Amino acid sequence: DKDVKYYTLEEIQKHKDSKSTWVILHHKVYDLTKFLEEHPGGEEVLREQAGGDATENFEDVGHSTDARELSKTYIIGELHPDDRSKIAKPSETL
Numbered sequence: 001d002k003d004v005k006y007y008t009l010e011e012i013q014k015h016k017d018s019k020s021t022w023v024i025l026h027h028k029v030y031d032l033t034k035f036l037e038e039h040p041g042g043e044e045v046l047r048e049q050a051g052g053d054a055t056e057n058f059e060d061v062g063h064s065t066d067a068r069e070l071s072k073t074y075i076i077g078e079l080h081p082d083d084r085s086k087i088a089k090p091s092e093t094l
């Protein structure tokens with residue numbers, strides 16, 4: 001296609017099992033499937049939610065700017081323009 005990798009909530013929510021753990025973090029989508037162990041913090045903490053707004057979780061901990069750039073290195077594509085009129089996504093806080 002010509003657009004980026006705009007993926008929908010349902011699709012991303014399917015990328016959280018078997019051995020594909022995605023997370024949506026801000027207005028973009030990140031594959032961390034080969035970052036699980038590599039993540040300086042762990043797999044489990046990262047796979048805890050998966051395929052949902054982990055933004056709240058990521059922002060709770062805040063993260064250093066290193067992570068904000070390294071995040072871009074994991075950028076597969078973006079959150080579909082569908083759920084963009086309402087970025088608001090009430091989910092688990094933890």
Ligand code: HEM
Pocket residue numbers: 023025030032039040041042045046048049054055057058061063064065066067068070071074
């Ligand atoms: C874009 C995806 C992410 C990247 C690239 C990333 C990167 C990093 C990096 C570089 C660190 C080391 C601390 C620092 O930033 O200076 C870190 C630590 C950590 N991250 Fe992430 N992270 C991501 C997503 C997440 C998410 C969604 C969670 C929560 C569900 C999480 C939980 C943690 C925790 C708990 C630590 C601290 C470990 C500890 O001190 O015990 N991270 N992350």
